[PDB]
Amino acid sequence: AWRLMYNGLETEKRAYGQESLLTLGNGYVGWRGASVFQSFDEHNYPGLYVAGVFNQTRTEVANKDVVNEDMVNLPNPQLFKLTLDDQPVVINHDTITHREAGVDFQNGLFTEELTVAVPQGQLTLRTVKAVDPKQYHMLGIQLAITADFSAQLQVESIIDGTLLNQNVARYRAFDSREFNVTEIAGDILTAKTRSTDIDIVVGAETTSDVMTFQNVEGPADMQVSTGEVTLQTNQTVQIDKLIAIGTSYELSEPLVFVQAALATHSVDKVIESSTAYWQEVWETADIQLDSDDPDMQLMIRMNIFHIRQAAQHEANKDLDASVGSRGLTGEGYRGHIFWDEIFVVPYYAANDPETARDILRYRIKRIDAAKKNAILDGEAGAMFPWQSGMYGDEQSQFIHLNTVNNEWEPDNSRLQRHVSLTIAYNIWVYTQITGDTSLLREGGLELLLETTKFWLNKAEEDADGRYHIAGVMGPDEYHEAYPGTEAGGIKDNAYTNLMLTWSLNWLLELAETQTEMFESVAHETDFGSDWLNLAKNVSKGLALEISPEGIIAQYAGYFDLEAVDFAAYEAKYGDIHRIDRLLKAEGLSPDDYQVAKQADTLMTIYNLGNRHMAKLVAQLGYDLPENWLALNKDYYLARTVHGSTTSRPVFAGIDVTLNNMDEALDYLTTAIGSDYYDIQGGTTAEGVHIGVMGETLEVIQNEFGGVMLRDGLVSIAPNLPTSWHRLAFTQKYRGTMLTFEMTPEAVTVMADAPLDVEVYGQPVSLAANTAQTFT
Numbered sequence: 001a002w003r004l005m006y007n008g009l010e011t012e013k014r015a016y017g018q019e020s021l022l023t024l025g026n027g028y029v030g031w032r033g034a035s036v037f038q039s040f041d042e043h044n045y046p047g048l049y050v051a052g053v054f055n056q057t058r059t060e061v062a063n064k065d066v067v068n069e070d071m072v073n074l075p076n077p078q079l080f081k082l083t084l085d086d087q088p089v090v091i092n093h094d095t096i097t098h099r100e101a102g103v104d105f106q107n108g109l110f111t112e113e114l115t116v117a118v119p120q121g122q123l124t125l126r127t128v129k130a131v132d133p134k135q136y137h138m139l140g141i142q143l144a145i146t147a148d149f150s151a152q153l154q155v156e157s158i159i160d161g162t163l164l165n166q167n168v169a170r171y172r173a174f175d176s177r178e179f180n181v182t183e184i185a186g187d188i189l190t191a192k193t194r195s196t197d198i199d200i201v202v203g204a205e206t207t208s209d210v211m212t213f214q215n216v217e218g219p220a221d222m223q224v225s226t227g228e229v230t231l232q233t234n235q236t237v238q239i240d241k242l243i244a245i246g247t248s249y250e251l252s253e254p255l256v257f258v259q260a261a262l263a264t265h266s267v268d269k270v271i272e273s274s275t276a277y278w279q280e281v282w283e284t285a286d287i288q289l290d291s292d293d294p295d296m297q298l299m300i301r302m303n304i305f306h307i308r309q310a311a312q313h314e315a316n317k318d319l320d321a322s323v324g325s326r327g328l329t330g331e332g333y334r335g336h337i338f339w340d341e342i343f344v345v346p347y348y349a350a351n352d353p354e355t356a357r358d359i360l361r362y363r364i365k366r367i368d369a370a371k372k373n374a375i376l377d378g379e380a381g382a383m384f385p386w387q388s389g390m391y392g393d394e395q396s397q398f399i400h401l402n403t404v405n406n407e408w409e410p411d412n413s414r415l416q417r418h419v420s421l422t423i424a425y426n427i428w429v430y431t432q433i434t435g436d437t438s439l440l441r442e443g444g445l446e447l448l449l450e451t452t453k454f455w456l457n458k459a460e461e462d463a464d465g466r467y468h469i470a471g472v473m474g475p476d477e478y479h480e481a482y483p484g485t486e487a488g489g490i491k492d493n494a495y496t497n498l499m500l501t502w503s504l505n506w507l508l509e510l511a512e513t514q515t516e517m518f519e520s521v522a523h524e525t526d527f528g529s530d531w532l533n534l535a536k537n538v539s540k541g542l543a544l545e546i547s548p549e550g551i552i553a554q555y556a557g558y559f560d561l562e563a564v565d566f567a568a569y570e571a572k573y574g575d576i577h578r579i580d581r582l583l584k585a586e587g588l589s590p591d592d593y594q595v596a597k598q599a600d601t602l603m604t605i606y607n608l609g610n611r612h613m614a615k616l617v618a619q620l621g622y623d624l625p626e627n628w629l630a631l632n633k634d635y636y637l638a639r640t641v642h643g644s645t646t647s648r649p650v651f652a653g654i655d656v657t658l659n660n661m662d663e664a665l666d667y668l669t670t671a672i673g674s675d676y677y678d679i680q681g682g683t684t685a686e687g688v689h690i691g692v693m694g695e696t697l698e699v700i701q702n703e704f705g706g707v708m709l710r711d712g713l714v715s716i717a718p719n720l721p722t723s724w725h726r727l728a729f730t731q732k733y734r735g736t737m738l739t740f741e742m743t744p745e746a747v748t749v750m751a752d753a754p755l756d757v758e759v760y761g762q763p764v765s766l767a768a769n770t771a772q773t774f775t
Contacts, residue, residue: 004302005102009093013682015043016167016330020684021302021675022103023329024110024129027051027315027355028136029245030328033101033110036078036127036141037091040166047167048074049328049335051321052249053200054390055178055193062401064408068171069389071324071335072178075161075189075202075223077243078129078141083154084118091116091125105305106282108133108274120149132270133277136315137261139243140270146236153231157206157213157241159189159223167331168686181221187262189223190255196390199248203258208239240267250319281308284737285351287700290726299672300700303693307344308352310690316358322388323359326687333686336395337362337388339419342607343646343694345426349433350709350731356430357439363423364443366392367450370420374454381453384423386414412480412488417458417472420451421499425607428506432710435734437514445510445521452507453527455500456534459542466543468492468556469500476554476600478580478590478643483561492556494601497542501616502608504539542620550625551635552617554601564593566641577643596640598647602633606650606698609708610657630658645674645692653703661721664704672696701729705742709733714757716749716774718742739771746775 006018022033030049038044049071059066082089091114098115110129115122128142145153161184164176179191179200188203204225206213211229218224229237244261246254285308287300310327325340326332341359348356367382369392374383376394385394400411427444431437440448459467471489473480474496481488511518511532522528545553553559564583569576576582580590580597599606604613610629617624625631633654642648648667655664671692675684683689701707705727706718714733720742727742736753749759750771757764759774766772 001297002106002301003102003104004298005100007100009043009096009099011043011093013685014678016045016685017675017678017682018101019045019047020326020329020686020688021306022101022110023047023306023309023327023688024103024108024131025309025328026131026133026136027310027312027321028250028319029131029139030309031129031131031139032329033103033129034078035091035101035112035114036080036129036143037082037114037125039076039079039160040163043093045167046076046078046163047330048076048078048245050074050200050245050247050249051316051319051328052390053193053198053247054196054335055198056195057175057178059174061173062406062408064399064401066174066397068174069334069336069395070165070171070176070178071328071331072193072198072200073163073165073167073331074200074245075159075179075181075191076163077139077159077202077204077245078241079158079160080143081156081158082123082145083156084120084151086152086154087119089116089118089123097122103305105301106278107271108278108305109271120147120151122148128271130267130271130274132265132273133312134273134314135261135265135269137245137257138265138270139245140267141241141243142267142271143239143241144236145231145239146234147231148234149231150233151231152228153237154226154228155206155211155213155239156218157204157225157227157239158218159202159204161189161191161202161221161223162219165331171331171334184218184221184223186215187223187225188255188258197248199254201246201254201258202243203262204241204243205262206239206241208237210237211239242267242270284730286729287697288726288728289700289724291721292723293669295676296669296672299676300697302676303672303697306688307347307690307693307697310344311348311355311359313352313354313358316355319358320362320365321359322362323690325689325691327690330685330687333387334395335389338386339416339422340646340691341426342422343691343698346429346433346710347694347697349430350733353430353434353436353732356426356434357436360427360430360439360444363388364439364447367443367447369393371450379454380457381455382420382447382450383417383454384420384451386416386419410486410488412473413477415471415473415480415489416475416477417454418474418493418496418499420454421496421503424448424451424503424506425499428503429710432712433733437517440510440514441517445514445517446525448503448507448510449521449525449527452503452535453525453531455503456531456538459534459538461541465541467538467541468543469496472496474555474600475598475603476596478595478597479555481591482557483589483592490555490557492543492545494544494552494554495603497544497620498604498613498616499607501539501542501620502612504535505616505619507535508539540619540621544617544620544622546622546624550628550631552601552628552632554596554636558594561594562592564595564639566595576641579641580643594639596636597643598640599636599650602636602650602654605629605654606695609711610654612711629654633658645671645689646695649692649695649699652699656699656703656719659719661719664699665721665723668696668699668704671699700727701731705729705740706747707731707740714738714755715761716740716747716757716759717761718747720744746773748773
């Protein structure tokens, strides 16, 4: 219910994947659930990451310099090496006779218990790891050692500054050294990133009731403290290691900070702080589901836990950082920031709104970098990059080495320009749910106006008054260009044009509802009446293509692409969720075919819902049949291979609307278990998938649970599966707490302040702390 537990040893990427899911974090660090006795090898990967701490490398590949910006794996502070009567204790898959490891979500504690066969007999090694969510620079290790014999035990407690970034196998071809160790002094190892000028300080103190540790000269780039104790048969020795982490990215004097931090804390305080923090969290953040699936309650809490470890206000208030696609759990996609934010910002807005505000500051601080990005590509306004890191410049690659013929081709990935509309959308959701218009005032409105300048300058009006947005890609990554051209991008992606229409509507509403802030920010950004009039015209004239049967074309010309025999590919190759690579191996181009990686046109429904999407299409002057949602869901589901973890939950939510409850529950269950079950093997080896974690909570709470907050009012219309006997959770709306209890036939809602809501479309006045039930 509350504990993620693993029994027995695992190997290679399956072992890496467990370490990812056993990661602890507090918004400032993420700390992989690797065994403290191991270093990077085929079955183990220690990893420690700090929010916003990146390094840039340069690797020569085929007469060309490839520059990569890597989230840094910090010097490893948890490494323990054991010695029995001056013989190294070998701890590996050949000597470990029992292993269990887990994280207790109730208190945030990782535990590992090992039994190890050594010449003299048996060694029991039990580890507790914890991160302090309040003194968030502090980490803690508790190690209990018991032998069924007596020997001299030496303990070496190490900060290992010799490691590289090696988590992702396909990245190992690149230069993987991210820092130089600059000094080791007493308890403290200092390092500096090679190209980004960040001082990294890692200090530790190792203590014990029955032994003393002393700092000694270790191998190069390793800080070492060592102690010695006589083990008595069956008598446990307990060792604490307190760790402090600081960098010059967030601190002006990280060395002094870490020295003072080690002198003023303890492992016991770390554990008690973690315990008290999570106990508080769960009083309102639990999402209780009594269903016929025995694993689903654990997976829900594992989602909440990892999302809240990825960012939490008590740390992120002091940080310049957002949530990467794998949080701080691994090196998959180098810790870059993606439009994946769209899957967690609404969660934070509804449940932990100050953390949402912290994460949105990351993009607002990078508005100027997005304006530079625009200018570099010959655009105007603010163009946010597809991949963002330290500086806010584009960190996707611009060119790609073709494996067949050793020659450089364009990389088109950055042409998913819709990421800018994700950012505006996340600020909208934040503002709608919290009512905190100070974020709009402190850069949010400037972001909307500058990104609008980008889209409005890119729009092309044709002879008939229709506006077109060309040269872009939508969320379906399989379509990067039209057939028969190397020019990147396609025209009039429906998702992009519809989200652009939404953002123009919001701009025009803010000009009326926030007039003084709008006129002030419009003056500073030169958003004059010429820009404002263009916004009005474009909001009415953007182009869509709709078939006579009512299908919205994914982009202009999509209906002329060729059909894929999916069943044939499934029979030949088995699994077609990477059909783009299957087609390319056959010399074919995915650009030529009606095949989708994930929701693209239907992504609009995830973001805005079907009613809002219908209003936008109508606003543009197009006529949809009344059953357009079923028709379009059927059409695109028949073409989608779910090459992304975030594809299935979009369809699941639509299926709830369509009352297709079995397929909705199947798709949710498949998606929510993707990291946990690891049927394919090693799926989470490079980090957990944070996006699918927030996206499956969305299906539970906002689709099945039927609670929406973004449309100017709390709207409650649950549609539970018959096997969901009880669903319960809370929400925060403009400072008011709501509590929900649903069964398949009723919903009870209570607010701690007066609130006018809608229940199944009907107006309802809630009185403070007076529940009402609707059946």
